[model samples]
Target: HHWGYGKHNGPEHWHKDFPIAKGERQSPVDIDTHTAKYDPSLKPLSVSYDQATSLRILNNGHAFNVEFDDSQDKAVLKGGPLDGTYRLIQFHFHWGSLDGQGSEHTVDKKKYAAELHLVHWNTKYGDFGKAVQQPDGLAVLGIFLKVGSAKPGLQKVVDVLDSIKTKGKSADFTNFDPRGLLPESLDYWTYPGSLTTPPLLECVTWIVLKEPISVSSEQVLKFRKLNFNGEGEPEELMVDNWRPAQPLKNRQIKASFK
Candidate 1:
């Protein structure tokens, strides 16, 4: 009985197991520019990733996470809304079941085709698992993916999907720079939010980029072919794994650019 993107165990039923599912700082919120406060003081994002730090990709029955070696800060993200350097732990994607829009976060209620999350944990907290319990322990860089021209940098990741087509499966993925996946402009929206998955800890400081990167429909099809089940289990395609937009409530989205 794990949390899944299905009718019985999906986001709607998450609150049954984790009460914080209804918390005020829930993530994947709709960004309304009119209401977002422009903060000129917000620093430019500093991102550095080493190709050697790239480890392997895992289909953990939730999403496919491209794991990294964060043992000694080989790759790091700082500046922006972060006070200290945070080590890059892993990066993952949330996509649609079909070619339709499936991004978790939206702009003016408009959805994109997919979303990418580069998860980082504050260095001050020592490690990721322990940091998740603190208020300012995690920083997730979210990048929206739109349907258009193919992304050359992204195809490297898509090529490995065939090797890890089922849950609990993983394959060695190395010498790939995570920085290549970012947009040209680093301007973003910052807010306090929680992990979109369970146990939904409210420790993330979300940094969602303003510009989106492009991905072809064929690449989207590769993600759709991945199965949520493990070896010898019934095949179930992995798609539409994103949570619906949550209430913004008293939260304010601070923008880095005008």
Candidate 2:
């Protein structure tokens, strides 16, 4: 009994004493802003993360983002594994405080000048960080970075986000296959989540697609001139790195169609 109980320990005491630690599942409250009901059959599925899978680029400095390590294609789980196939395990972005607004998944609560979380896993369950704990394992695909103009599919990931600014400075992004920033139309809305931060792990199964991919406010100030040198750690810069929205205690949000 280590007694230190971790994973941020919030979300209502984070499973006091570890009851499956609240069994990791809490994601609801993104009503797309006042919910004007823009479901004109929300579409976007023209995917092709640069011939798909096996690309790498990670700078733990703050957030340069990009990582896909598919377990070795059997065509990548081929529709089985809950139809997800896991392997693109990393990809990040979220901003605001100016130039638009930060994002943490607020649909009807609407707050999207930026937001992107493509953390995937389900390799039939287990692996990829222990599949987040399970509630269907994991499958995140939320993309939305509004603004407009200039988004030739994000000019190949903003031409490699300025060659990994600083910190750990990662490179070798390879021939690019980051799925071209996904968002042509796959029409989605699947629910069930966890890991929106904290030990919050209900083994996410969210798809969150509905078209929204265009960035150019100088590529969002180059992700708002990101930096990561939290000196001795305790959160300093990395500019308001989001992660504060969890209280949909009773979930159910589905909508998938071609």
Candidate 3:
């Protein structure tokens, strides 16, 4: 069955179906930067993307997603807590109806309007399906979104929201380079955690950026216009599609810089 961020299907209620919801090392942990130990061993992340690899954009009912041509490492991420390279697969967002709070992982207990996830799979895993079960299988680059000036770089993504307003709907999105959405600084807080969404696999190495990119309030309003239900179902707006921060437990949140 499917789950959502509804009061009935939301984060706290998720434990009923997914056993790991209460398991150790859950995701969306609050990043207390003041206590995060500096790690000199870490290196700056290296990213290279082939803009033409973007295939199409689809609303997975969870969030709108941009798929890529992942036959090989046309787009990949290396360095920064990773022993080997990970191939870029898909990317998506989790947001709120308003800018007050939406991001999964918070900084010093502070929340942002939204968060973007660039999902990639480890090359050592051999295949995407098998990778999810491994302890170190995925690396998700998380960039928080704060409401500020109009973002022309993000305009292309918001423009297609209308086409996929209904859940499970999608549209053609050719040649939109995701690199444009990134903040100028790549300094981040790295930790081992699970996927913020359902099945809640504990395999992701979260690389949450220290800085945020801007997106206007009106642009976020477009995300609010999207529906949580399918075409024939009673219309429900997509808002606050984010999970609260879980316990940090035994894991350490390491910073790449002092």
TM-score-best of 1 and 2: 1
- State the displacement of the C-alpha of residue 10, model 2, in Å, after optimal TM-score superposition: 38
lDDT of each: 0.90, 0.59, 0.89
State the lDDT of candidate 2 residue by residue for 1-258, as single tens digits. 222112353334545655544443565346443322333443433233444554667656545577665665421312311455665666787666464466767776666777788776777665877677667667777887888787775677767766665557677765565556766676666666776544556777677666878778887777666555423444323443555455655565655542
Task: Give the per-residue lDDT of model 1 (tens digit) for 166-187.
Answer: 8889999988888779889998
> Who wins the lDDT comparison?
1
Give the per-residue lDDT of model 3 (tens digit) for 109-132: 999999999999998988988889
Q: Estimate each model's TM-score.
A: 0.97, 0.29, 0.97
Q: What CA RMSD would candidate 2 show?
A: 18.3
RMSD of each: 1.1, 18.3, 1.1
- The order by descending lDDT is 1, 3, 2
Give, for candidate 1, the lowest lDDT window spanning 10 residues.
Answer: 46-55
Clashing pairs in 1: none
List where candidate 2 sits over 4 angstroms from the true fold: 1-63, 71-81, 97-100, 112-114, 119-139, 143-163, 166-223, 227-258
What is the lDDT for 238 in model 2?
47
